[PDB]
Structure formats: C-alpha cells, structure tokens
Amino acid sequence: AVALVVDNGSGMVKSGLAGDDAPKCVFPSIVGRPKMPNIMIGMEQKECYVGDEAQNKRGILTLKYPIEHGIVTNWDDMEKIWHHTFYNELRVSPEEHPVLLTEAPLNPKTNREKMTQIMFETFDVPAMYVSIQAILSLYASGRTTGIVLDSGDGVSHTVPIYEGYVLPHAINRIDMAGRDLTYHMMKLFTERGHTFTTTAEREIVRDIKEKLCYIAMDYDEELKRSEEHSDEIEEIYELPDGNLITVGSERFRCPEALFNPTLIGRECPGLHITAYQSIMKCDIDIRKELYNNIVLSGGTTMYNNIGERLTKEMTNLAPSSMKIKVIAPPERKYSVWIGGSILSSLSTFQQMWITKEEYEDSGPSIVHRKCF
Amino acid sequence: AVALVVDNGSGMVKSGLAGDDAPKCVFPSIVGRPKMPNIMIGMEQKECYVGDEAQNKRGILTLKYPIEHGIVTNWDDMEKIWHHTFYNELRVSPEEHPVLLTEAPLNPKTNREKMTQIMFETFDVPAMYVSIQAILSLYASGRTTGIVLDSGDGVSHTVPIYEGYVLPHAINRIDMAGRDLTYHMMKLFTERGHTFTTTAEREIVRDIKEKLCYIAMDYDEELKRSEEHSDEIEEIYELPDGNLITVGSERFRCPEALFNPTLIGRECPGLHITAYQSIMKCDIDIRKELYNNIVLSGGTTMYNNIGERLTKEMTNLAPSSMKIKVIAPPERKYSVWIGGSILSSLSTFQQMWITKEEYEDSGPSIVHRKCF
Amino acid sequence: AVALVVDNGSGMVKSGLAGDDAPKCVFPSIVGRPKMPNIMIGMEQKECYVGDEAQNKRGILTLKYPIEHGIVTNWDDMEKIWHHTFYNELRVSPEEHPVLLTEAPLNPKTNREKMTQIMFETFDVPAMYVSIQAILSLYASGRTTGIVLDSGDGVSHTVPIYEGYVLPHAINRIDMAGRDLTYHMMKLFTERGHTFTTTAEREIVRDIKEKLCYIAMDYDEELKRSEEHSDEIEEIYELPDGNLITVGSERFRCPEALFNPTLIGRECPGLHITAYQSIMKCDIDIRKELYNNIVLSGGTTMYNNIGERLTKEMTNLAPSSMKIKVIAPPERKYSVWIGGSILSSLSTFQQMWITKEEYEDSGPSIVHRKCF
Ligand SMILES: C/C1=C\[C@H](C)C[C@H](C)OC(=O)C[C@H](c2ccc(O)cc2)NC(=O)[C@@H](Cc2c(Br)[nH]c3ccccc23)N(C)C(=O)[C@H](C)NC(=O)[C@@H](C)C1
Ligand SMILES: C/C1=C\[C@H](C)C[C@H](C)OC(=O)C[C@H](c2ccc(O)cc2)NC(=O)[C@@H](Cc2c(Br)[nH]c3ccccc23)N(C)C(=O)[C@H](C)NC(=O)[C@@H](C)C1
Ligand SMILES: C/C1=C\[C@H](C)C[C@H](C)OC(=O)C[C@H](c2ccc(O)cc2)NC(=O)[C@@H](Cc2c(Br)[nH]c3ccccc23)N(C)C(=O)[C@H](C)NC(=O)[C@@H](C)C1
Ligand SMILES: Nc1ncnc2c1ncn2[C@@H]1O[C@H](COP(=O)(O)OP(=O)(O)O)[C@@H](O)[C@H]1O
Ligand SMILES: Nc1ncnc2c1ncn2[C@@H]1O[C@H](COP(=O)(O)OP(=O)(O)O)[C@@H](O)[C@H]1O
Ligand SMILES: Nc1ncnc2c1ncn2[C@@H]1O[C@H](COP(=O)(O)OP(=O)(O)O)[C@@H](O)[C@H]1O
Ligand SMILES: [Mg+2]
Ligand SMILES: [Mg+2]
Ligand SMILES: [Mg+2]
C-alpha cells in the first residue's frame, strides 16, 4: 500500500504518491463562490469552485483562503479542499492508502486534534501521521546537521538540528511571508498611480511579484542609482486586459521587507537576525557545525541573489574565524514534499503509523504522545 | 401545450408558436382612426383599424403608436392590439397556451404589473413569463459569453453576460433609435425642397430610409466627395403618387447620428462609446472575453457597413494587444423571437412559469420576485 | 502676511483667510463650455464659465469636473479654477500671501509635484505647504487622540492618530462617496418612471439627495413598513420647470450603500467594517483610546441618524467591555478648513514653509522630504 504525501500550505497544496521525486498535483488553496445572478437556464452551475477551476473563473467569484498563518480558520472549506484533492486530483480511494501530513511548529493542539478527527472519521484512512516541515526539508537534503530556514506563504520558521537531535528551545517562528510582501507591493504600486483592491487584482499583483522581483546587494546604493539612471531597471508587464504597466524600483523594494520588517510596520527582527539568534541559543560546541550547514526552504526563498545576500549579512554577525555556507539547492519549492516521500518509504518508519484501532481506543488525543 | 412567443416592439409586433425558427405573424403596431364623415350608406365601417389594415387605408386615418420608448402609454390600444394578435393573426385561443413576453431592461415596475394583470384577468392565460430581450438575443446565438447591443425603434441598450452570469451594474440603456433617424431624415429632406408632415408621409420617409440608407466608413471624406462628384451616390425613388424624388447625400448622413448624437441635438454618447464604457465597468479579467464576442441585434443594426465601422471604431479605443470581432449574423431582425422560442422549448424552463393560482394568491406583485 | 487656506475637494472648493472660523468663498468645482451657436451680436460671451456662473447657465453648457477621486485629471481646468479663486473670489494677490493646500492620503507623487510646480511657476507664491486632510480635521476638534473618518465627494479614508503620532500602516482609503450615491439615486428613480441623463439632471438629483435623504436604523423593518404603509415617508419635490416628483422609499435606500457597497456592485467593505479593521491593525494598548474618540468629517457624513447607526454597528463588533462614542460635531462640513486655519496661525509652524529659494535650488521634488 503506497502512501499519499499531502503538503497543505497557506497558498498552495501539493499532493502525490510516495516514492516519486516530484509532486503530481500542485494547485492553489482557494474556495470560490459566485456573487452574480444566474440567468442562462440550461447550463449547470456549482455552488463552490475549488482549486484551478476557481482561479480561471475568478472574475465572477469571491475567493476565500481557508488557512491563515498555518492555522485552519474554516474547516468546511478545508474538508472541501481535501475531498477535491483525494477524488478529483489523484483519483485514488483514501480508504486504502496511508496519509502523511505536515504542519508548522509551535501550533495549537486543537488544530492537530481536529485534523486527526477529520482524517479518521470522514475519510476513514487506515493509518496517518503528522510531521514537522523543517525535518522533512532536512531529510530531502540528505544531511543530519544544519539549521533549516523555511518560509512559505503564511509563516516563516527556523529550526536547528544536530546529528539527529532537535533543540526545541532554539526554534523560532514569525508570521511574515509572501502575503505580506504582496500587500507591500500593492501599497508601493499606489505611488505610481495604480490601484489594486479586489482579490483578482491581488492575484495579478502576486504574479507580478513572482515574475519581476529580485533582491539587491546594497540597498542604499540601489536607491541612489534609481534616481540618476532608473531606465536600467524598467520593465513592462502586460495586464490581462491588454494594458501595459511599468515596473521600476518596486522590483527590489518589495523583497527588502524580509531583511527589514520595519518597512511594513512590524517590530519583528529580520531573517538574518532571526537565524543568528537561533544559532546563538544552542550550545557553544555545535555553533561551528550549524554555521556551515545553513539550508534554505520554501517558495519565498526563490528570489535572485538571496544566498549571496544572506551570506554577506551572516558574515558581518559571525566571528571572523568562522566559515558560512548558505546552501540554496534548486527545486527547493517542493523540498518538503520530497523529504516526506523519502521518509515514507523507509522500512523503519512502518512501525510509527497511527492505526485505526489505536485512535478508536484512545481518541483524538493520541496524536500528541506519538507524533512530535 | 405549445407556448406562444409574442415580441412586442415599439414599431413592429412579432408573434408565433414555440419550436419554429421564423415568426408567423409580423405586423406594425399602429391604431388607426377615421377623420372623415361617412356618407355611403350600405357599407360596413369600423371604429378603429389595427395592424396592416390600418397601413393600407392610412390616407383617411390618423395613426397612433401605443408604445413609446418601450413603455406602454395607452393601455386600451395595447389591449386592442393583443386581441387582434390573438384572435385575428394566430387564431388560437389564449386560454389554452402559455404566453412568453419580452421587455426592455430598466423599465418601471408598474408596466410589468399592468401587463401581468391584463394578461391574467382579461385573456385568462394558464401561465405567463416575462424575460429581457438581450438574454433571448444571446440565447438565439448559441453562446454564453458576450456583450449584446440591441437597438430597435424606441430604445437601444447594451448588456454584458459572462458564462451565464449577468452584470446588472454594467447595463446601459439610451433612448435613441430608428424613429429619431426618421425624424432626422425628414429634417434633411427639407434642405432639398421636400416637406413631409403627416403620418403617412412619415411612413413614406421611413420606407425611404429602410431602402436607400447605408453607413460610410469615413464621414469627412464622403462629405468632401459629395461635392466634387455627387452623381455617384444619386438615386431616384418613386413616390406612391407617381412623382420622383432624388436622394443624394442623405443616404449616409441619416445613420451617422448613431455614432454622433450631437447632430440630432442629444448629449448622449455614441454607440461605440456606449459599448466601450459598458465593457470598462466589468472586471479586468472578463474584458478580454467580452471584447471578442460583440453581438448585434435589432432592426436598426441592419444597415450596410455597420460591422466594419463598429470594428474600426472599437479598435481605436481598445488596447493594441486586444482582438475585436463584431458578430453580425443574418436574420438578426428576429433574433429575439428565435431566442425566446428556443428558451420556451427547454425541459428545464417548465418549472419557471407563473401559474394562475400563484397570481391569485399573491397578486400582480409576484412578477418581481420570480421574473428577473 | 496672513496666509490663504484653500481646500480643493472633488465637488466643492473652499477658500479663505487664516484666522477666521468660516470659509469666505465656497463654490462648486466645475468648468462649463457652451454647446450652442451664438447669434445675438452685441453681447459679450466667454469661452468657459467657472464656478457659480456655470451653475446658473448650465442649461446651455456642458460641465466638466477636473478632479476625480481626489486626483487632478485635467490641469488646464484646475489652473482656471485656481485663477478664478485667487482673482475673482478673494481678490487678493497670490504673490504676497503664503498658500496652504490639502490632499488626500495615498495619492501619487506626480500630483504633488505638479501642484507645487504650478503654484511656484505660474502664481509665484512666496511660500507653500501641503498637508493631509484628516490631520487638519483632528486639529479642528482640539484633540490629539482619535480615528478620523473623512468622506467627501470622490474618496473616503480613515486615519488613526494616537497622542500626536500617526500610524501609516493602519490608514485605509476607498473610492466610494457622494457621487456614487448620486448615481445610485438616479438608478433608483428609474423604477418610478423618472429618467435623469444630462449633467443638469445630475445636479438636480444631487440636490434632491441633499434635501430629502436620511439613514434608517433598521433596514429590513423599514423595507417591510414601506409596503403596508408607504404614505408616512412620501414627500413632494418641485422640479425647476414646475413639475412635481414623489419621493418615497428612495429617501433611505440611497445612503444605505454606505453600509453595504454590494448594492451598487462594489466588493469593498462598508464604513463600520473599514473603521473596525483600521482600529484592529493598531497596537492592543491604544485600541481602548481609539474606540472612544471616533470623529466624523466630510460632507457625506451629514445625513440624519448617522452617529447612532454607526455607534450601533460598532457596538456589535467591539468587545462587550468597551465604550464607543461617535463624535459628530456640527459644522463638520468645513472642519478641514477650520483645522487648516488653526494650524496656519501657530507660531511654531512658521519654520515649516517651503520657500522659493529652496524650491529653486532643489526642484519640485522637495515636497516629498519636507511635507508628510
Ligand atoms: C492599473 C490598472 C490599469 C491602469 C488604468 C493602466 C494604466 C496604464 O495606468 C494608468 O493609466 C495610471 C493612472 C494614473 C497615472 C498617473 C496619474 O498621475 C494619475 C493616474 N491610474 C489611474 O487612473 C487610477 C485612478 C486611481 C483611482 Br480610481 N484611485 C487611485 C489611487 C491612487 C492612484 C491612482 C488612483 N486607476 C484608474 C486605477 O488605479 C484602476 C482602478 N486600476 C485598475 O483598474 C487595475 C486593475 C489595472
Ligand atoms: C416631396 C413631394 C412632392 C414633390 C412636389 C415632388 C417634386 C419632385 O418635388 C419638388 O417639386 C420640390 C419642390 C421645390 C424644389 C426646389 C425649390 O427651390 C422649391 C421647391 N418642393 C415644393 O414645391 C414643396 C413646397 C414647400 C412647402 Br408648401 N413648404 C416647404 C418647406 C421647405 C421646402 C419646400 C417647401 N412642396 C410642394 C412640398 O414639400 C410638398 C408639400 N411635399 C409633398 O407633397 C410630399 C408628400 C411629396
Ligand atoms: C422626471 C421629470 C419629468 C416627469 C415627466 C415629471 C412627471 C410628474 O413624471 C412622470 O410623468 C412619470 C412618467 C411615467 C410614470 C409612470 C409610467 O408608468 C410611465 C411614465 N415618466 C416618463 O414619462 C418618462 C418617460 C421615460 C423615458 Br423617455 N425613458 C424612461 C425610462 C424609464 C422610465 C421612464 C422613462 N419621462 C418623460 C422622463 O423620464 C423624462 C425624460 N424626465 C425628465 O424630463 C426629468 C428631467 C424630469
Ligand atoms: N519565483 C518566485 N520568486 C519570488 N517569490 C515566489 C516565487 N515563487 C513563489 N513565490 C512566493 O512563494 C509563495 C508560495 O510559497 P509556498 O512554499 O507555496 O507556500 P506554502 O508553504 O504555503 O505552500 C507565493 O505566495 C509566492 O508569492
Ligand atoms: N433594412 C433596414 N435598413 C435600415 N433600417 C431598418 C431596416 N429594416 C428595419 N429598419 C429600422 O428598424 C426599425 C424596426 O426595428 P424593430 O427591431 O422592428 O423594433 P422593435 O424592437 O420595436 O420591434 C424600423 O423603425 C426601421 O426604421
Ligand atoms: N445635508 C447633506 N445631506 C446629505 N449629503 C450631503 C449634504 N450636504 C452635502 N452632501 C454631500 O456631500 C458632498 C460634498 O462633500 P464635500 O465635503 O464638499 O466634498 P469635498 O471633500 O470634495 O469638498 C456632495 O456631493 C453632497 O452629495
Ligand atoms: Mg511550506
Ligand atoms: Mg426589439
Ligand atoms: Mg473633503
């Protein structure tokens, strides 16, 4: 019985079969509902559109995200999304395959309890398991020592691991990700005379950010250069309705909020500062090994010149006798899914499943004593 | 029980049976009354002539139009016209067939209430229904996405529809149609020495307009050409009394008021401007689909070189990366009736009729909550 | 040298001298142009009418608004309006008095740059300054802590201020104001059989809205009452040509779009929702102080039963242990001008002017680093 790997993010949902090295079904996590009267009798209509079929007809729909900051807010929408994933994307009966789920660290217990209850009572899966995302990201890299910096759409967290042992007192988690960058980009576009307010406009701005953004090495010099010669960074983007929008300095002022959250109005520290403070809460012996195995993960770390900028920032904070190597592997967008698929194929893991009888005898609270 | 399709316009009335692709009874909507003393005893005379029998003996009659700008002004004349349609044209008892009626958008509620009350108390039809004309025009084309530009004799309106959902905030309606063009033609004929004042003269001018009018591609160049060489556009028309009238430039200066209502003294915008402003009030995503499904309807859109002129005007207003296709199907004069006949034959529509018992229990106000 | 206070709105222009508590020249912001041939030789005519002299002879004029949503669209018309204000309304040379201007938040930089360039090159004022409207509205109330909800003719925005410090990350701005309400009223009047299309008809509808509108406490019950007994809310309004129009339910269905923008077809949230979301983006400590200092401003907040309705809506959203007090002072129509006049008389402000030499040495870009 091949297991199912389902990574439920805040902006995207990945799903596939264990043993493969690439997810088979990746689609946005949105629920669309119509806001207009239906007049044309004779054509069938649906109450709610889930996934890509809500991203194409979004002009007449209102879109909802059922997950905010890695926490499920609406459970009916999440049930609809899981049903769509199981029966419309993979088309495999969930009553014959074990399911491996992922979750961010430092989350409420009720989230895990409700997830287990839904997975066991509605779909009636044989076995299930919940694991942390940073552990799977480290699994996907084929290492055992390093500090993992994961950053997705709702939450970014750093976790150190040394030779198979995790240090829970040095785990950090902040709520600042690509959605805040999208909002910052929307705010910056106002200064040029362009206004985006609706959800579809937000998706357009998100696509613009994903296409035309990069990280600058020296922020002050780039701002100075954006005055004497701004023509070198100008780009033209074609709106879906045929209009053309000019993107200039906003190509590098949007991601800068990752290293300076004061721009968006947040008091939380930056990314390099967070990594350094997470390293400094570990024992003095393992700091040298942690400094040389920095691993990047998530979709928000896909900008250009991210590894070099992070290395330069870390160098100014670390002792002069220390070597810093920021590992930024390709295809890190799906690193968590690859790590989960690798973990689910190990022969040793077959005795760590939460079976149906154990849940029935113990209840939804069993997920705390078994899963970490 | 086959339903009756009755399209009540401002200048013409179409009527027929559901399932056919061509109206069976098309006749003008006029009520004629004599204005001369009757002397010849022995021959029968009637107080009022309705339909074609008032168009032939119009020399001794005064003609009244009971509908102005899609609004019924005199209800007794409309009752007479409906009686003539039911008992003299189709010769089918209205007490056994459901009736499907049409109406222009953005009309007063009292019109619909009075129409329902008359159809239910006088004729005592089993079931009835009222629908918008643009929806039926889109039904007749076999599509689901597009912007419909309907233009008849009293009112011209544009309505966008996207995948079965109508956008009521983007519906436009102006009162400028073939009757205003007839008045403009009458005014233009004065400059050549010809005067038309009576109603029969108005009908003659209307026939001249329907026969010898076309739309020019370039107005200024055509006006310039109408001086150096006017003989190429000269036509001779035989008046009913045998006289000959010469029609020259007025062949293309009459319809030009559709794209420039300032000629007739109106401040309303043109047709292409109205279509563009109706497209621009929709969401940015569906504008591309609306731009490629422009549908023409009504009898006023039957001029020559109308589609090419509309396409050229729309091209200068749309973004350069957009494709515009003006759909101008033949037999679009009766497109609304064809769409209504198609709609009335669907098996799904059989549960959307306003039955007699519902009207009796609720009153004439039921037509608002059920019909759109 | 007494300064000049000039508040440039989207529908009205206020102007006066610093130190007074009431604007001296208030007039609409419209530019009128004739659309008819001039035949009577011997009487002088003007190419364009600005201000009240275009509101009286509007029957033969086409009227243009040079400001849309707080953004100047046509600069020639704005120059004409400023010239009329300086030389025809106040009759004071602008070459001897400093000028204080106002602007809505979150506006393009080019607007401010062009405004400064025009004020410094054409009129050649000694000093100038640009400030936000909500700050002046809070100045006029004699407070330092509160959330200001300004709503005029083109844009409505909310800004929180705590003890002299503004929170730019909690400032909201939406484009929904009295002009949209006028359009909604025009659409509602169609259902009774009345049609307004021209600009003068729009002004008539605006006057009707300003005279006979109020806000209902319970919308559903009012709609139910408007059926059993509609005679209690009927009013008669005399049209300028002597006709009488009956205004019934539309007295309270027009302003309802402020608390439900879905009626007019907009996806933006209501006013109470916007205020609540602007309060919830501030720090937890200052929310209690913000909840008790809600200040209303603008001309669109002049309806009846607005404060009570806003208080009732806010109560259902705030925690049960919080006290909400909506401050709705009289003469809030000119609150921004009063606040600007108070600010311009302070002895401390005399060192915050943009002098001519600084602009000459730095350019039109100086307005960004000095003015907020
Ligand atoms: C950007 C887009 C199309 C664009 C029209 C494509 C073209 C290419 O850009 C322009 O034409 C820039 C132009 C503009 C540019 C410079 C200027 O000194 C004034 C206006 N901007 C405008 O007219 C503003 C007016 C405006 C409203 Br109301 N409140 C606002 C708040 C802040 C700023 C401006 C505004 N405007 C129409 C919009 O934002 C509209 C709603 N935006 C869209 O529909 C998105 C989905 C696509
Ligand atoms: C056009 C018709 C017949 C026509 C006689 C057929 C022939 C073929 O056309 C002419 O002979 C053109 C001729 C004419 C031509 C050139 C000219 O420098 C002067 C007159 N026009 C006239 O005599 C005018 C005189 C007129 C009266 Br009074 N007020 C008017 C207001 C404006 C203009 C002119 C007038 N006239 C007799 C008419 O309009 C009559 C009432 N029209 C008809 O019965 C219609 C139903 C059919
Ligand atoms: C409201 C005004 C005067 C009024 C005549 C004053 C009087 C007091 O009201 C009436 O008589 C109501 C009456 C009417 C009432 C009930 C009814 O079942 C049918 C008509 N309405 C009409 O005749 C419509 C006809 C109409 C044209 Br075309 N398209 C329209 C689109 C929608 C609705 C109706 C129409 N009509 C003449 C107008 O709108 C004119 C253009 N409106 C004006 O000039 C304004 C500036 C002042
Ligand atoms: N090439 C790219 N450049 C910059 N940002 C990107 C790129 N690709 C994706 N993103 C951002 O990453 C986010 C997706 O992250 P993802 O890892 O899918 O989150 P989750 O963990 O919730 O699945 C998107 O919001 C997008 O803004
Ligand atoms: N071949 C044609 N060329 C130009 N105009 C025409 C032609 N046929 C009809 N018309 C105009 O169209 C009008 C009829 O439109 P119609 O669709 O019957 O209006 P309604 O919607 O009221 O029935 C007439 O007034 C006539 O002037
Ligand atoms: N007494 C009133 N009742 C309701 N609405 C009003 C009243 N007075 C003015 N208004 C509305 O307020 C608008 C004027 O707002 P104003 O503050 O002058 O805008 P601006 O900020 O552009 O100057 C007008 O469009 C009008 O519709
Ligand atoms: Mg993730
Ligand atoms: Mg028609
Ligand atoms: Mg204002």
Author numbering:
A (entry chain C), B (entry chain A), C (entry chain B): 5 to 376
Quote the authors verbatim.
Actin II is one of the most divergent actins among eukaryotes. The structure and function of actin II are not as well understood, but mutational analyses have revealed two essential functions in male gametogenesis and in the oocyst. Unlike actin I, actin II readily forms long filaments in vitro, and near-atomic structures in the presence or absence of jasplakinolide reveal very similar structures.
The binding site of JAS is the same as for phalloidin; between three protomers. The average resolution of the actin II filaments with and without JAS are similar, 3.3 and 3.5 Å, respectively, according to Fourier correlation, using the 0.143 criterion. Density for ADP and Mg2+ was clearly identified in both maps. Furthermore, JAS does not affect the overall architecture of the actin II filaments or the conformations of the D-loop and the C terminus. The D-loop in our structures has a closed conformation (P41 and E48). Notably, the distance between R62 and D289 in JAS-stabilized F-actin II is shorter than in F-actin II without JAS. In JAS-stabilized actin II, density for the leaving phosphate is not observed.
